[PDB]
Structures are given as C-alpha cells and as structure tokens.
Amino acid sequence: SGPVPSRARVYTDVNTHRPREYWDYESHVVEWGNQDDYQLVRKLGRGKYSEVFEAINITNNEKVVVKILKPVKKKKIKREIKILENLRGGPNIITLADIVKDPVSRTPALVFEHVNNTDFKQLYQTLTDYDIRFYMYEILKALDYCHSMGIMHRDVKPHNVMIDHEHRKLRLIDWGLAEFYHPGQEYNVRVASRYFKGPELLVDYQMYDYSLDMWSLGCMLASMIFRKEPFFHGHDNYDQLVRIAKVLGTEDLYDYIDKYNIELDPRFNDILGRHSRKRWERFVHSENQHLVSPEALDFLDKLLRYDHQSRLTAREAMEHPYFYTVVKDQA
C-alpha cells in the first residue's frame, strides 16, 4: 500500500471557497508596465532563475529592486505574480510594484519595493534576545497571513528575510517557490535550501502543507539563538536527514514513517542509524546563552517536529510565552 494522505490542520479549504481565478494561475493574464520607467543602477546579486538589480523609477525618483528572470516556464512566472498580487498589502510581505518586459529581449522583470537590508551574516551577530523575538514575531505575521490566504512560501531562510534594522522593518521576499495549498495535492519535494528542508521533503512525502514553513522557521530560530549557522549541516539531502536525526532522535523519525506509511529510500537504511533525542542544552555555551531561555527552547521544540501535523501553526506560535514582551510592547 502507498502513503497515508494528509490535510492541513488550519486553513484547509480557504482556496476551495475562493473563485477559480484566485489560485488558477495558469489562466492568469499578466498586466505589463512600461520598462522605460526604470533605469538600472547596480547589480545586487543572483538566484537559480534570476539576476537582481537596484533601479530607479524615473517618474517618481523612488528606489526599487528589479528581478530580471532567466528562462522559466510561463506558468511558474504567472504563479509568482499571482501569489504576490494576492498577498499585496499583507503584513511584512514584499510589495510587487510592477511587471515589465524588454521589447527586444522579451525577458520579463519583476519590480519590488526596496528594503535597505543589513546582510544577515553581519546583522545576526549584533541582535539581542529581544531583537530575535521581535523579528521572529514579524515573520510570523507574514506566514500566518500568506497561510490564511491559502499560500505556502516553501523557501523560508535568512536570505529571503530582508531586514532594515534602523527602521525595525522586516519583509518576507522571493515568492518564486511559493504554492497554493489544495487538500489532497501532491507537491514537488525538490524545494527549499538543503539546510532548511523539512523532514517531509527528505523522506519524499508529497502531501505536505503550510507546516513546511514552520520547520524552516525553526531552523532559522535555532541558528539565531545558538549562533550555529547552519543548525542542521547536511552534506546532501540524505545526510541532511541524518543531521536532524542526530538531534531529534531516530525513534520519532521511524514513528513518523510508520504513521504515514512512507516508503523510505534504501540509501537511508544504512546511514540513519540509531540516535537518541538530544536535549537543547548541548547547543548552549557562554557566547550564546544570553539568547537562550526556557521560553526559546520550549518554542523551538514545538516547531522542530518530524510530524508536520504536530508542529505549531504561525498563529499558535504567535501565542507562545516567548513573544509576551513583544505583544505587550506592540500595544
């Protein structure tokens, strides 16, 4: 027999109750702006499917980010565009300002609001216990929102979180891997960065949901409070599961495989071994202890579970004692 099906615990049928056009991105017709409104200033970087630049909108003198796409399936472009338009105005979601195409090259480019970001590989070592909780709460506003809107980001990692520390401003960016959740749908597990991949991606369980973003968010939190980046440091997708197993133990892993009747790749049988569930204290030391508290550890534990159904929802996470001070300070 095959795998046991699964449904999202919350926001299960949000897309089913929406008109077809909300999620049927394949039938989406793109609204194109004028390319001459933008002049590229400098290169910012690249991705698997793009080259990103800093630009100037000459009509209003505003600073923007231009994501010029490499060859990608029109439906994958429509998907990102649709999700971005659907999430517009949502708490801490990047704003899609425009969509332009080169008349000659025929290359599409997405125009985004600019975030004056402090690179995470410099900012994170300066963050206080309060800063981590404050910014963890801001990602949760973004995740609860996109989830409530029937969308999973599927690529939550430090690189996709743009923080302007001077203005305490956070934006969850790059929605190019995001999908619409539909009960019963089997998704592609070849998503996310190795270090942030949930156990469900590693064991090849396709009927995953929003809970996948909660794992990634746990990996982020673990790296921030322990100053251990990456927290689960796999050599490949097989070793990545071994790294999680060495912390969370093999017992709960085989219980998870049992529960959903998962066909495990024979390669795993000889590498997974037998490992006990570790206590979070073994990651605590004198240079990180000021960031670790019993609240942080209780919150972390409730995120980093093999069983996606047992992880906290973004809304449940926002109610954790870890955020009591942030919640009081926002009133």
Picking from 263, 241, 271, 267, the residue whose alpha carbon sits closest to that of residue 253 is 241
Report whether 242 contacts 271 (CB < 8 A).
Answer: yes
Close Cβ partners of 313 (under 8 Å, ≥ 6 residues apart) = 9, 10, 144, 147, 210, 211, 214
User: If binding is defined by CB under 6 A, does position 45 make contact with ligand 5Y2?
Assistant: yes
Query: Is residue 67 a known part of a binding site?
Result: yes
CB closer to ligand 5Y2, 142 vs 173: 173
Q: How far is CA 88 from CA 52, 83, 201, 281, in A?
A: 20, 9, 28, 41
User: If binding is defined by CB under 6 A, does position 189 make contact with ligand 5Y2?
Assistant: no
Out of 144, 174, 179, 200, the only residue in the binding site for ligand 5Y2 (CB under 6 A) is: 174
CB closer to ligand 5Y2, 54 vs 301: 54
Query: Is residue 273 a known part of a binding site?
Result: no
Number of residues located near ligand 5Y2, criterion CB under 6 A: 16
| 209 is known as an active-site residue | no
Window 212 to 241, contacts with ligand 5Y2 (CB under 6 A): none
User: If binding is defined by CB under 6 A, does position 52 make contact with ligand 5Y2?
Assistant: yes
Query: Is residue 49 a known part of a binding site?
Result: yes
Cα 176 to Cα 192: distance, rounded to the nearest angstrom: 11
User: If binding is defined by CB under 6 A, does position 117 make contact with ligand 5Y2?
Assistant: yes
CB closer to ligand 5Y2, 141 vs 159: 159
Out of 8, 173, 212, 300, the only residue in the binding site for ligand 5Y2 (CB under 6 A) is: 173
Compose the 55-74 pattern: x for residues touching ligand 5Y2 by CB under 6 A, - for all others: ----------x-x-------
Cα 278 to Cα 248: distance, rounded to the nearest angstrom: 6
- CA angle in degrees (0–180, nearest 5) for 166-170-175: 145
Out of 11, 53, 112, 323, the only residue in the binding site for ligand 5Y2 (CB under 6 A) is: 112
Out of 69, 93, 94, 161, the only residue in the binding site for ligand 5Y2 (CB under 6 A) is: 94
Active-site residue identified among 98, 155, 174, 209: 155
User: If binding is defined by CB under 6 A, does position 140 make contact with ligand 5Y2?
Assistant: no
Task: Note the residues at the interface with ligand 5Y2 (CB under 6 A).
Answer: 44-45, 47, 50, 52, 65, 67, 94, 112, 114-117, 162, 173-174
Please report, in range form, the residues annotated as the binding site for ATP: 44-52, 67
